[PDB]
Amino acid sequence: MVLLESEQFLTELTRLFQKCRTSGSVYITLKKYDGRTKPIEPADNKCLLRATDGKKKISTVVSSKEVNKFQMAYSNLLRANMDGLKKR
Amino acid sequence: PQYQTWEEFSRAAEKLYLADPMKARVVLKYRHSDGNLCVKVTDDLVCLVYKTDQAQDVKKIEKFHSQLMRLMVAK
Numbered sequence: 001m002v003l004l005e006s007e008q009f010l011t012e013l014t015r016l017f018q019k020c021r022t023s024g025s026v027y028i029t030l031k032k033y034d035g036r037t038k039p040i041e042p043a044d045n046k047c048l049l050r051a052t053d054g055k056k057k058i059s060t061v062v063s064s065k066e067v068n069k070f071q072m073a074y075s076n077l078l079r080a081n082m083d084g085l086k087k088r
Numbered sequence: 089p090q091y092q093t094w095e096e097f098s099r100a101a102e103k104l105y106l107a108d109p110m111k112a113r114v115v116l117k118y119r120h121s122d123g124n125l126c127v128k129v130t131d132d133l134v135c136l137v138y139k140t141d142q143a144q145d146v147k148k149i150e151k152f153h154s155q156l157m158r159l160m161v162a163k
Contacts, residue, residue, distance in 0.1 A: 028116040085143035
């Protein structure tokens, strides 16, 4: 798939959230990433996040050296783009 | 099955991930048109799902996702 870095991944996730506003759903999947590139070397410090809407899909890999920078930005992006609920 | 309490859902989900870090996966679904949020954690053996229509759940889901990422990256 379209594998991008965190900087472009967040921007494209923003576009997905905006495009799935009036019609469409946003699918976000998080899973521990081993690092394999060939069918069954195995790394234990990677995580994989895939964002799709049915038509366009993007994927990203976050490691230890970038977890600290990516966590806050991802949480802020979710807070900004996941509005539209009841406030009780 | 499905849960009603976010605290119990997260408590079960973290234990499910700790049971098998590789088999476990997490999916987040957001429906702006219907104003609904869904969080699922499954390892193809036991699945836990939680649906919400409250704005208070966004920060909790963010914290849960951040902690999951940190735990996954940590050995």
